[PDB]
């Protein structure tokens, strides 16, 4: 006895399910001392200090979320550190860094694997150099975010630092 | 000895993280037999059959790949078929009918929330009714995409039915 108008029936249904993401970004802030020799292709000084207000994961309310006391705790701790304390070439192209990494006030040593892109004197005769640090760190080393389980946010962060730089006077 | 060149420098990180979301869907293409007594409100005959080809989950390689073996075989299993058994009134606004449900061959009974949201004589002089099934069921009770697992994907289906529908002649 009814027949169902289509144009304003609608046979529904609704599913949870998860997704998987990276989440990318940089810092717009930061600063370094690079001493490095073009004779050998080795570090002799890594110095970077990021400036942790000014990240980026291209994301306006995440980076406000992230400078809170559940993630980098901006407030009190404004910046992170990383210094490089041994170098250990492998050829010209490949080494291995060794630093100390800190973040939120908590140091623990990393290893980077460094590679040289470019090195090269440019058309003003001075030195130019590109290079990128790769590595993994763990949140739990730093005890980092502590309050997101791992489940939702990785303990795994990868670092991909990707620099060119030009001799200094 | 080096000054960076931040123009070309990119202090960059990449951390994976898990995101929860609900798939909405309908089907475009179905059938159903309504029988309805306005006199008491309530359902004496609900029969529907859908046409599993028909699926919208708004995106298109999504709704090709609920077709496949892993999910719904439409091609073995062409509909999906439900048929009430039993309205059991509560008011003329609400009542719980219970009727079968069949997915891809497997048969069981389930209870939806059926909520009358109009019963009326149009302008015409024929009736019209409103009304909403709303229920749960578990994929794994109809052995439905078995091969996923309920981390992914929940094992939770959310029923939404609404229709409107007017007297037949």
Known sequence: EYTLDKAHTDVGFKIKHLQI??????????????????????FKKLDVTIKIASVNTENQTRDNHLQQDDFFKAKKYPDMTFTMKKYEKIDNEKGKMTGTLTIAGVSKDIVLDAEIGGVAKGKDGKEKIGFSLNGKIKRSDFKFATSTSTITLSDDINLNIEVEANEKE
């Open 21 to 42: 993401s990276n989440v990318k970004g940089n810092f717009k802030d930061y600063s370094a001392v690079i001493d490095f020799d073009p004779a050998s292709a080795e």
